[PDB]
């Protein structure tokens, strides 16, 4: 006292990878030496009498304490400064949501903002839409501390399905006159779902014939989102493409199928739905049969009175036949009737009863032909 050594400015705040000027001086009349201790890269530089100046550029260092030294009178004169690099949130990220999140299942939300500083100036917010869920001021984290993460565990709500969630970070440079700088991570929309036991209730008649169209329905309730769930219904390889009704959490699929001409109904009826990563499938055994329509013929179909006529009917040998009350004799093949034409037999029609049993189910076909 005297002398002294001064560095200007003593405190400095700059952009990361940014630059500034430093003027370090002393009152020493004939400095025997002078210079600056720092690790930072220098672009330009200046100097003069009793004062030396440096432009330091590309500063990625969160905290650096450079020191200007002047050697005078075989003695060292040191002045230490402080350099801090602030960070704008050019990078704000948020973790992938569950592709489907079961409603009622706790899931977690993490917001990672790599390279954020100073940590003590940061207030982070995890929020659903306009409403803040969790807010964290990091003030009091060490001056050298950089980076910020916020995790919040959350219960899944049904009314919160389809909303937009985000992580908003707020940096306060207001004390330094630089002011607030805030940013928002890419908003993520959540997909949720719900299910239930009691596999789908499918209703169908168990008997089927080709060339005939019969309706079949499959339903279930307590399913959300109803609209976002897709359902499949088919007979064997053949798809029914049913009419799908959706009311609230319940659905209705109605169609009218047609038998496929092949074997079965040892085939099956498959009703399944896929929502989220889950599926509930119920199956139904059934029966498709082939029952050839019985043919009724007469020769001559129109005859004079008294002329002998013949009449026959056949089920294809696999079914039993009743011809005008007369059973097939013998059963394995068609029966017959013959007579002399009668005046009272004009406009007389005859019945042919074909009976085929499958799974105990008795099937009949009434077919008649009038005589002229
Ligand atoms: C869904 O997520 C939530 C959020 O993490 C969470 O629910 C919690 O489940 C746990 C275990 O089921 C419970 O947590 C605690 O349970 C004890 C009883 O053993 C309570 O006494 C606790 O109350 C105090 O908790 C703090 C102490 O750690 C106190 O500081 C505070 O003042 C409370 O008085 C606490 O509830 C509980 O069932 C809930 N907790 C809450 C508050 O919701 C869990 O991860 C998921 N819930 C499920 C799966 O049911
Ligand atoms: C309803 O839910 C059911 C869940 O089981 C689901 O079943 C699937 O049906 C399809 C046909 O519709 C299956 O078909 C596959 O077809 C291809 C040929 O194109 C095969 O390569 C597949 O191979 C499997 O089976 C082979 C033997 O045939 C094996 O060698 C092989 O290793 C495989 O196991 C298979 O035959 C399909 O496998 C099933 N299952 C699944 C998990 O998809 C049905 O699709 C659902 N309906 C809808 C629209 O959601
Ligand atoms: C250190 O890195 C520097 C970059 O950070 C490089 O800068 C060299 O020098 C100048 C200044 O940076 C560059 O720009 C030139 O600017 C003048 C105009 O000068 C303006 O400012 C003066 C006050 O100084 C003012 O009086 C004038 O009215 C202007 O408004 C232009 O006319 C030039 O064409 C030029 O663009 C140079 O480009 C750059 N040098 C080279 C070779 O590119 C430099 O590499 C390092 N050194 C210094 C001293 O900065
Ligand atoms: C950093 O070094 C000092 C800051 O302390 C600055 O020195 C300045 O130099 C000018 C030169 O014209 C001074 O102007 C005159 O100096 C004479 C003495 O040489 C004096 O008699 C005059 O009255 C007048 O002041 C100026 O005073 C001086 N500034 C200060 C604050 O002392 C220099 O400009 C700075 N350089 C850089 C690159 O920052
Ligand atoms: C949260 O933000 C999203 C947008 O980021 C809002 O939902 C969006 O609604 C629009 C308009 O219906 C959807 O647009 C399109 O729908 C057609 C179907 O007609 C589809 O083909 C397009 O590909 C597109 O999806 C859009 O899907 C939907 N956005 C998302 C992310 O699903 C929503 O309204 C906002 N929620 C709140 C609470 O404000
Ligand atoms: C906000 O985030 C976007 C996307 O990462 C980024 O490009 C942008 O620089 C940020 N804006 C501000 C001013 O923080
Ligand atoms: C459906 O098919 C299976 C063959 O795996 C059979 O065991 C079962 O008895 C059938 N169901 C009915 C109701 O007949
Ligand atoms: C019907 O035809 C048969 C066959 O020739 C004949 O024997 C019989 O007399 C005929 N019956 C009558 C009542 O015409
Ligand atoms: C004859 O036709 C009627 C009307 O379609 C039907 O209800 C009945 O089952 C048939 N008779 C027999 C024995 O198949």
From Swiss-Prot:
- Keyword Transmembrane recorded: yes
Disulfide bridge partners, by residue number: 24-68, 28-72, 111-167, 218-271, 313-352
Q: Which residues form the Ig-like C2-type domain?
A: 17-99, 104-204, 211-298, 306-371
Q: Which UniProt keywords apply?
A: Cell adhesion, Disulfide bond, Glycoprotein, Immunoglobulin domain, Membrane, Phosphoprotein, Repeat, Signal, Transmembrane, Transmembrane helix
The Swiss-Prot or TrEMBL record describes its family as follows:
Belongs to the immunoglobulin superfamily. ICAM family.
> GO MF annotations for this entry?
integrin binding
Q: How is it modified after translation?
A: Glycosylation at Asn-23 is critical for functional folding.
- Could you say which residues of the full protein are shown? 32 to 403 of 924
Q: Which residues are glycosylated?
A: 23, 43, 106, 164, 183, 272, 285, 340, 366
Highest taxon of the lineage: Eukaryota
Annotated effect of mutating residue 109 to V: In a breast cancer sample; somatic mutation
The entry's cellular-component GO terms read: glutamatergic synapse; plasma membrane; postsynapse
Could you say which tissues express the protein in this record? Answer: Expressed on neurons in the most rostral segment of the mammalian brain, the telencephalon.
Principal localization?
membrane
Q: Where in the cell is it found?
A: Membrane
Q: Which residues carry this modification: Phosphothreonine?
A: 151, 153
Q: Which GO terms describe its biological process?
A: cell adhesion; cell-cell adhesion; phagocytosis; regulation of synapse assembly
Annotated protein name in UniProt? Intercellular adhesion molecule 5
Role according to the record? ICAM proteins are ligands for the leukocyte adhesion protein LFA-1 (integrin alpha-L/beta-2).
């Amino acid at each position: 006292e005297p002398f002294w050594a001064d560095l200007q400015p003593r405190v400095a705040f700059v952009e990361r990878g940014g630059s500034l000027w430093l003027n370090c001086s002393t009152n020493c009349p004939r400095p025997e030496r002078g210079g600056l201790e720092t690790s930072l890269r220098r672009n330009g530089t200046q100097r003069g009498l009793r004062w030396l100046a440096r432009q330091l550029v590309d500063i990625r260092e969160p905290e650096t304490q450079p020191v200007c030294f002047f050697r005078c009178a075989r003695r060292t004169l040191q002045a230490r400064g402080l350099i801090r690099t602030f960070q704008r949130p050019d990078r704000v990220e948020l973790m992938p949501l569950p592709p489907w999140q079961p409603v009622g299942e706790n899931f977690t939300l993490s917001c990672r903002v790599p390279g954020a500083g100073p940590r003590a100036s940061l207030t982070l917010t995890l929020l659903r839409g306009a409403q803040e869920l969790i807010r964290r001021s990091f003030a009091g984290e060490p001056p050298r501390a950089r980076g910020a993460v916020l995790t919040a565990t959350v219960l899944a709500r049904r009314e919160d399905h389809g909303a937009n969630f985000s992580c908003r970070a707020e940096l306060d440079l207001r004390p330094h006159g630089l002011g607030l700088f805030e940013n928002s991570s890419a908003p993520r929309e959540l997909r949720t779902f719900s299910l239930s036991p009691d596999a789908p209730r499918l209703a169908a008649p168990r008997l089927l014939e080709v060339g005939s169209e019969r309706p079949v329905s499959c339903t279930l309730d307590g399913l959300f989102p109803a609209s976002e769930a897709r359902v499949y219904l088919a007979l064997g390889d053949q798809n029914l493409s049913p009419d799908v009704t959706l009311e609230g959490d319940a659905f209705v699929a109605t169609a009218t199928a047609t038998a496929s001409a092949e074997q079965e109904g040892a085939r099956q009826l498959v009703c399944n739905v896929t929502l989220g990563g889950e599926n509930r499938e119920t199956r139904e055994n059934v029966t498709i049969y082939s029952f050839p329509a019985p043919l009724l013929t007469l020769s001559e179909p129109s005859v004079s009175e008294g002329q002998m006529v013949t009449v026959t009917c056949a089920a294809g040998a696999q079914a039993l036949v009743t011809l005008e009350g007369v059973p097939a004799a013998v059963p394995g093949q068609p029966a017959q009737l013959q007579l002399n034409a009668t005046e009272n037999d004009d406009r007389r029609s005859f019945f042919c009863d074909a009976t085929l049993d499958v799974d105990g189910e008795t099937l009949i076909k009434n077919r008649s032909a009038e005589l002229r």
